[PDB]
Design an enzyme around this catalytic site. Structure first.
Site, PDB file in Angstrom:
ATOM      1  N   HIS B  41       0.661  -1.016  -0.074  1.00  0.00           N
ATOM      2  CA  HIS B  41       0.246  -0.053  -0.013  1.00  0.00           C
ATOM      3  C   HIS B  41       0.922   1.233  -0.091  1.00  0.00           C
ATOM      4  O   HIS B  41       0.371   2.238  -0.530  1.00  0.00           O
ATOM      5  CB  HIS B  41      -0.841  -0.037   1.154  1.00  0.00           C
ATOM      6  CG  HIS B  41      -1.516   1.308   1.397  1.00  0.00           C
ATOM      7  ND1 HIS B  41      -2.868   1.240   0.667  1.00  0.00           N
ATOM      8  CD2 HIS B  41      -1.830   2.129   1.994  1.00  0.00           C
ATOM      9  CE1 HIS B  41      -3.489   2.505   0.766  1.00  0.00           C
ATOM     10  NE2 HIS B  41      -2.775   3.118   1.625  1.00  0.00           N
ATOM     11  N   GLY B 143      -3.702   4.987   9.563  1.00  0.00           N
ATOM     12  CA  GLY B 143      -2.157   4.967  10.050  1.00  0.00           C
ATOM     13  C   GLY B 143      -1.610   3.463  10.317  1.00  0.00           C
ATOM     14  O   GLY B 143      -0.343   3.451  10.634  1.00  0.00           O
ATOM     15  N   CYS B 145      -1.956   0.782   9.053  1.00  0.00           N
ATOM     16  CA  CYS B 145      -1.304   0.019   8.052  1.00  0.00           C
ATOM     17  C   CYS B 145       0.081  -0.617   8.396  1.00  0.00           C
ATOM     18  O   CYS B 145       0.871   0.298   8.765  1.00  0.00           O
ATOM     19  CB  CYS B 145      -1.219   0.470   6.907  1.00  0.00           C
ATOM     20  SG  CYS B 145      -2.745   0.799   5.732  1.00  0.00           S
TER      21      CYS B 145
END
Ligand code: NA
Ligand code: NA
Lengths: 301, 301
Positions: B41, B143, B145
């Site tokens: 990502h 945030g 991730c």
């Protein structure tokens, strides 16, 4: 989103745990700078647990009778002293892993992480609340004496709890880091009344705000109430009375959700009077009181 | 005694968390030896989240476009590669805090600790279970991730989960450390079916054994059942069928309590058919399925 009972990351505390042995008794200590803190229980034996004479017991002990090990590193004890229900063992090396830290006496209704430890070795971490009656509903096995509770605020660890005992009722009692028990308890193996507990109203309210923030909204209703009227209900259901100080502490959550504190109180009233009707809130079928307003705002942003 | 949802002590994992930034996107990585692991990502932007072409995106990136910081220590990236949904950033320094570790793909019904992290910095730790449908019911904000899930067995950390996404339903999806999603999910911002979940029967049974071990015994009854008869009820209430392998895994708890597995199943049957009658078990008004038999034996001895 989601809402979980979340502990602080325990790394800064795990580096401070040691094993302390005195005679045949082993328990956990906390090594900060050149001082090791542990329950004074370490100097008792079975056969004097009904009413230990700690001053006499300690007089029989010298520095060299306290064995302290940090991992397999043995520490050299160069002084000892008892304060209240704790022992302070001066050692000759400062802990290189000492975090920035403070000792705090927390208030009933405040939460903290517990690092459950056995033989100086950390086994798990969980959150709990100091009950209104100054007990904690922990999880602690034989050997857990000396385990500690804490909060962390930007790399500063605030130690607030050191575990001592399980009462015959299954709930737990302990001290601040200056060795003063929370509550009426004494460090002897005796039945001791904890006295009536209550539900922590301001935390239940915080948790309902957390529920709304996550979209569990079914319990919101078309009613409002007054502080006085809600406190009548609070007393009926053995909840703490709500004060304007509690209302003020809930103001950020109020502002965030647009739900006035007294409107949330009217929802809570209805939940108390009608129950949950076989539904759930944030995965619970009971009203949860172990999240403070500060906890909710932490985990919800 | 007492029974809590207890996480592993997170210290060994906290030492491995870093921040990784690529362009304008920041998330968390895991630094083990001289490799940093993070969700792929990190190379996307808003405006390509509906269906990112990761191979094309990555081709635009060089080593020097990945910024990795461990605390305020900046790491130098000397290689990059994508495997499945993860990126592997080779750096020029081995993490001095690397624990003994392994990468494992856990099974549905197994539990693990999650270290929730933001900007490379640990914020809290909690336990959860991999659902039968391969989701997790976490607590994760923008945030998060790259946050990781793990188990620890005698100083060996078994990493099993790296967090990616929240589905539009509020539940969470992620990968093993080789970047393979648990479940049918893909790393794009799209509605994705998780499909029917079930309750983890063998864990509910484990938890009832934990209840008895703590003296919550009110649900024990004078009945027994068969695997076949219980599985009829399990199917009615959307519980996983019980196998003899599950019976075998429950044998230590059976032996400890003296309650045969099929007798405990008869209690569970009655609970499913009659509900809890406004009572609680280990502080819960629902049947809890996020403790494995191995978890119960850990915390109960
Ligand atoms: Na609460
Ligand atoms: Na369970």
């Amino acid at each position: 989103s989601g809402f979980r009972k979340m502990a602080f990351p325990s790394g800064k505390v795990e580096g401070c745990m040691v094993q302390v042995t005195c005679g045949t008794t082993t328990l956990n200590g906390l090594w900060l700078d050149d001082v090791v803190y542990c329950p004074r229980h370490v100097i008792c034996t079975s056969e004097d647990m009904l009413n230990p004479n700690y001053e006499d017991l300690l007089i029989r002990k010298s520095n060299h009778n306290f064995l302290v090990q940090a991992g397999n590193v043995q520490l050299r004890v160069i002084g000892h002293s008892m304060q209240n229900c704790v022992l302070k063992l001066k050692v000759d090396t400062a802990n290189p892993k000492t975090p920035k830290y403070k000792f705090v006496r927390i208030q009933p209704g405040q939460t903290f992480s517990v690092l459950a430890c056995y033989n100086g070795s950390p086994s798990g971490v969980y959150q709990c609340a100091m009950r209104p009656n100054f007990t904690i509903k922990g999880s602690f096995l034989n050997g857990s004496c000396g385990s500690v509770g804490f909060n962390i605020d930007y790399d500063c660890v605030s130690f607030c709890y050191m575990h001592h005992m399980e009462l015959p009722t299954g709930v737990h009692a302990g001290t601040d880091l200056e060795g003063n028990f929370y509550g009426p308890f004494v460090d002897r193996q005796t039945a001791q009344a904890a006295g009536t507990d209550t539900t922590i109203t301001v935390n239940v309210l915080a948790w309902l705000y957390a529920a709304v923030i996550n979209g569990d909204r079914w319990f919101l209703n078309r009613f409002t109430t007054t502080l006085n009227d809600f406190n009548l209900v609070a007393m009926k259901y053995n909840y703490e009375p709500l004060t304007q100080d509690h209302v003020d502490i809930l103001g950020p959550l109020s502002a965030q959700t647009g739900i006035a504190v007294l409107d949330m109180c009217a929802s809570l009233k209805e939940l108390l009077q009608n129950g949950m009707n076989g539904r759930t809130i944030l995965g619970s079928a009971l009203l949860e009181d172990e999240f403070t307003p500060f906890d909710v705002v932490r985990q919800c942003s």
